[PDB]
Design a binder for this molecule. Structure first.
Ligand SMILES: O=C(O)CNC(=O)c1ncc2c(I)cccc2c1O
Ligand SMILES: [Fe+2]
Length: 216
């Protein structure tokens, strides 16, 4: 339970060895459900974008859109538990600093709340930071209660380094995931056939971000 124990006994060794780390039952049912209620309220009050344009070849009404997003700072009214999650992620990273590779984390992005609408859209294979923009660690929190991939799809498939086999991660309720943001972890989201929510924050390495400024 103690953030420092989780960090030192699991996250750090797992990340340095696999570059990926999954933590289940991170905040508990109560808090996880509260975060779910907050994200759902954001959706129901129209705070999300309409979704990534998947197919344009169509004509306005025929357009297909995918993942919808909304940026959350964490202090907005109705988003405080999301803020609590962010602070909890920050706490783990703080306890890991100086131990995640040779990176020195000194900041992060706001939270990106994503919603795959369940219309069969996913996210194409990609690398979060392929050009050295400063991001070294991707942190994702999932909040989909009773998610069954064999039925609803939406698996996050990561292809670690240049190894043959890949890793499938179900977007399970109260699951926390960390992985290196660079080319070591290309990944994709398989088609989702039910509403799928995730909250992502990216952590910056001090040196990479300092020189990224000279790239604009
Ligand atoms: O949701 C997951 O399990 C994994 N998603 C992603 O990798 C992922 N990566 C980058 C993203 C961007 I630049 C913008 C919207 C959504 C998004 C994503 O959803
Ligand atoms: Fe990604």
């Amino acid at each position: 339970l103690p953030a420092l124990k989780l960090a030192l006994e699991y996250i750090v060794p797992c990340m340095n060895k696999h570059g990926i780390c999954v933590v289940d039952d991170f905040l508990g049912k109560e808090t996880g459900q509260q975060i779910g209620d907050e994200v759902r309220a954001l959706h129901d009050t129209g705070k999300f974008t309409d979704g990534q344009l998947v197919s344009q070849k169509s004509d306005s009404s025929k357009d297909i859109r995918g993942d919808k997003i909304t940026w959350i700072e964490g202090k907005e009214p109705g988003c405080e538990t999301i803020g609590l999650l962010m602070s909890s992620m920050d706490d783990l990273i703080r306890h890991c600093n100086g131990k995640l590779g040779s990176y020195k984390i000194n900041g992060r992005t706001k939270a990106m709340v994503a919603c795959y609408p369940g219309n069969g859209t996913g996210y194409v294979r990609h690398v979060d930071n392929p050009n050295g923009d400063g991001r070294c660690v991707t942190c994702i929190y999932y909040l989909n209660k009773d998610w069954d991939a064999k039925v609803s799809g939406g698996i996050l498939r990561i292809f670690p380094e240049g190894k043959a086999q890949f890793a499938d991660i179900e977007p399970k309720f109260d699951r926390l995931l960390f992985f290196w943001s660079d080319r070591r972890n290309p990944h994709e989201v398989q088609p989702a056939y039910a509403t799928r929510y995730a909250i992502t924050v990216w952590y910056f390495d001090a040196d990479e971000r300092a020189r990224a400024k000279v790239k604009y």
